[PDB]
Write an enzyme that holds these catalytic residues in place. Structure first.
Site, short mmCIF file in Angstrom:
data_model
loop_
_atom_site.label_atom_id
_atom_site.label_comp_id
_atom_site.label_asym_id
_atom_site.label_seq_id
_atom_site.Cartn_x
_atom_site.Cartn_y
_atom_site.Cartn_z
CG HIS A 157 -0.29 0.23 2.51
ND1 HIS A 157 -0.10 -0.79 3.42
CD2 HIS A 157 0.21 1.35 3.09
CE1 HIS A 157 0.48 -0.31 4.52
NE2 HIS A 157 0.68 0.99 4.35
N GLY A 184 3.16 5.70 10.67
CA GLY A 184 4.44 5.44 10.03
C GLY A 184 5.13 4.16 10.46
CB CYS A 214 2.95 0.42 7.55
SG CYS A 214 1.25 0.48 8.17
C1 LIG Z 1 0.79 2.15 8.51
O1 LIG Z 1 1.85 2.82 9.06
C2 LIG Z 1 0.38 2.83 7.18
O2 LIG Z 1 1.43 2.87 6.26
C3 LIG Z 1 -0.42 2.31 9.39
C4 LIG Z 1 -0.70 1.54 10.70
C5 LIG Z 1 -0.85 2.47 12.02
C6 LIG Z 1 -0.94 3.68 12.03
C7 LIG Z 1 -0.96 4.09 13.70
N1 LIG Z 1 -0.80 3.01 14.41
C8 LIG Z 1 -0.72 1.81 13.49
O3 LIG Z 1 -0.56 0.66 13.70
N2 LIG Z 1 -1.45 1.57 8.70
C9 LIG Z 1 -2.70 2.13 8.29
O4 LIG Z 1 -2.91 3.27 8.51
C10 LIG Z 1 -3.64 1.20 7.56
C11 LIG Z 1 -3.42 1.40 6.06
C12 LIG Z 1 -4.07 0.26 5.30
C13 LIG Z 1 -3.27 -0.99 5.41
C14 LIG Z 1 -4.19 0.64 3.84
N3 LIG Z 1 -4.99 1.51 7.94
C15 LIG Z 1 -5.41 1.19 9.26
O5 LIG Z 1 -4.65 0.68 10.01
C16 LIG Z 1 -6.80 1.50 9.69
C17 LIG Z 1 -7.81 2.06 8.89
C18 LIG Z 1 -8.90 2.18 9.67
C19 LIG Z 1 -10.34 2.72 9.37
O6 LIG Z 1 -10.64 3.18 8.08
C20 LIG Z 1 -10.96 4.53 8.05
C21 LIG Z 1 -11.38 2.74 10.43
C22 LIG Z 1 -11.04 2.24 11.79
C23 LIG Z 1 -9.67 1.72 12.06
C24 LIG Z 1 -8.59 1.71 10.94
N4 LIG Z 1 -7.30 1.32 10.91
#
Ligand SMILES: *[C@@](O)(CO)[C@H](C[C@@H]1CCNC1=O)NC(=O)[C@H](CC(C)C)NC(=O)c1cc2c(OC)cccc2[nH]1
Ligand SMILES: *[C@@](O)(CO)[C@H](C[C@@H]1CCNC1=O)NC(=O)[C@H](CC(C)C)NC(=O)c1cc2c(OC)cccc2[nH]1
Lengths: 303, 305
Positions: free
Chosen positions: B41, B143, B145
């Site tokens: 992603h 950040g 991920c």
């Molecule tokens: C990565 O760093 C993105 O690159 C990030 C994970 C976190 C951010 C803060 N703490 C973490 O663990 N991942 C995300 O933001 C992912 C991205 C996906 C894989 C495309 N998205 C989520 O983790 C996420 C989205 C949502 C949501 O919708 C809107 C509703 C409720 C919870 C949620 N989590």
């Protein structure tokens, strides 16, 4: 989100761990530049350790009496001295992996990362707190002496702990990198007790703020308390008194959650007097006190 | 003595962490030999993540659209491919710090060390257990991920986890190093709920063996049981059923203490049915389920790597 006991990445320290052997005694050493630091009781035999006259034992030793191995290579000792309970073994080779480092003495209630080692090889990492009675609740087995504790600030490793002993109660004691013990402990083979183990109050409050930041508020209440009235109750339960400096250090957590510090204190007072029933806070059945305000800020800022 | 959640030394993994950026989207990647692995992603814009078509979005990207950095040093991308939810980027430099490694897919109950990373820089290390509902109770911020979880064995780093998602409940979800998610989650910007979690029975038993090793054995009872009867009972208390592998990995602790596995199951069964009766085990009235048999062994015998 989430809150977990977290240690620093130990790679910069892993490249400094060596094995130090004198006779039949072996433990870990810390290799920075052309100096290897290790607990001085390595020069002792099993019989000497009962009551060692370290100055007497040390003068009767030669450089070749010290076998220092960094992985496979053996480092030639070209000098040796003592700084309190730390033996300083000069070597003919400077560690090329020596990072930016400093020697500091940590204060009680502060946390640091421990790199547990055996035979000079890193084995595990975990976070510890220097308790008010100057002990630490670590995980150390035979051969762990010489393991070091540290904090990292940007690119600088601040060494604050070197391991020496496990008390009969199962807690652990050690020195700073200048060889001064934390607490009233001595490096002789005797059963030793620490002072009364008081609870780090400012840390427990920080950990309650972390619980709230992570969506748990069952312990909150509408009551409030003065600083003195809270400290009266806290001291009754063997908690350290909360200073105005502690209140100030908790500011960021208070602003983020909107819960005044003295409001959190009223919650802790209720928990101390009523217990937690069968409930848990952040998965714990006891009030955790080994998280500093900064440990919470670093993991909960922006959540 | 002492019992702690202990992470592996992470030096071998720290030397492999890098930053991967596409447009303004940045996360962590894993640099092993001349390939960098990272969540796919990264190629998505903030709006792309709401409903992405990664096959379509990837067709529009070329090697020159990928910024890979070890510190401030750029690693020129010379090839790219997608494997499940993981992006693989060939770079022109083989990581001189590449350790002996392997890619493994762990089971629920297994533990691993997480190297939390941000902008390609390691920030913290902590131990995690893969829950039966395929989440982990981690500590991850924006950040994070691309952060990986790993175990260390014969000087070999076994990578098992790459971070992708935070659930509404505050737990976390991710994939193995082949891009296959743990659990029924998808890399999409949507609130996804995990199944009802259960207690990891094999780890609770390991924790009981740990107590017996330390002389705390009041809970040892005179009964035994069959594996099937215990599994049926344990499920009524939200405990996961034991497998043949669970019985086998409990072998060393069973031989060390002389307590047969099924004998200690009967003891755990009584603790579930009757409670602790105001008593504690290893200082706690709560049964711990995030210590595997190896963690109990590795910590009661000090194994190094
Ligand atoms: C990565 O760093 C993105 O690159 C990030 C994970 C976190 C951010 C803060 N703490 C973490 O663990 N991942 C995300 O933001 C992912 C991205 C996906 C894989 C495309 N998205 C989520 O983790 C996420 C989205 C949502 C949501 O919708 C809107 C509703 C409720 C919870 C949620 N989590
Ligand atoms: C070092 O590895 C020694 O090289 C070792 C520390 C541990 C051993 C097991 N778990 C540990 O953390 N340290 C010691 O063995 C020290 C050596 C001293 C400093 C010379 N000794 C103790 O820690 C110790 C001695 C005694 C004792 O005597 C008699 C009685 C009761 C407890 C106790 N601990």
């Amino acid at each position: 989100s989430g809150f977990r006991k977290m240690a620093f990445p130990a790679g910069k320290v892993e490249g400094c761990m060596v094995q130090v052997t004198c006779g039949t005694t072996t433990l870990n050493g810390l290799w920075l530049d052309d100096v290897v630091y290790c607990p001085r009781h390595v020069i002792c035999t099993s019989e000497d350790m009962l009551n060692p006259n370290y100055e007497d034992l040390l003068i009767r030793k030669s450089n070749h009496n010290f076998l220092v191995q960094a992985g496979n290579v053996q480092l030639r000792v070209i000098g040796h001295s003592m700084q309190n309970c730390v033996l300083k073994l000069k070597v003919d080779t400077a560690n090329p992996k020596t990072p930016k480092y400093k020697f500091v003495r940590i204060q009680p209630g502060q946390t640091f990362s421990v790199l547990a080692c055996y035979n000079g090889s890193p084995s595990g990492v975990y976070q510890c707190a220097m308790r008010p009675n100057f002990t630490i609740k670590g995980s150390f087995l035979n051969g762990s002496c010489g393991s070091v504790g540290f904090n990292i600030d940007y690119d600088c490793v601040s060494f604050c702990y070197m391991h020496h002993m496990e008390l009969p109660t199962g807690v652990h004691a050690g020195t700073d990198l200048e060889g001064n013990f934390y607490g009233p402990f001595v490096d002789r083979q005797t059963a030793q007790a620490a002072g009364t183990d008081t609870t780090i109050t400012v840390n427990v409050l920080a950990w309650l703020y972390a619980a709230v930041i992570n969506g748990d508020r069952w312990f909150l209440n509408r009551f409030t308390t003065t600083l003195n009235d809270f400290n009266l109750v806290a001291m009754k339960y063997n908690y350290e008194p909360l200073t105005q400096d502690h209140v100030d250090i908790l500011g960021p957590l208070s602003a983020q959650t909107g819960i005044a510090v003295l409001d959190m204190c009223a919650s802790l007072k209720e928990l101390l007097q009523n217990g937690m029933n069968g409930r848990t806070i952040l998965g714990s059945a006891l009030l955790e006190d080994e998280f500093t305000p900064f440990d919470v800020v670093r993991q909960c800022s922006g959540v």
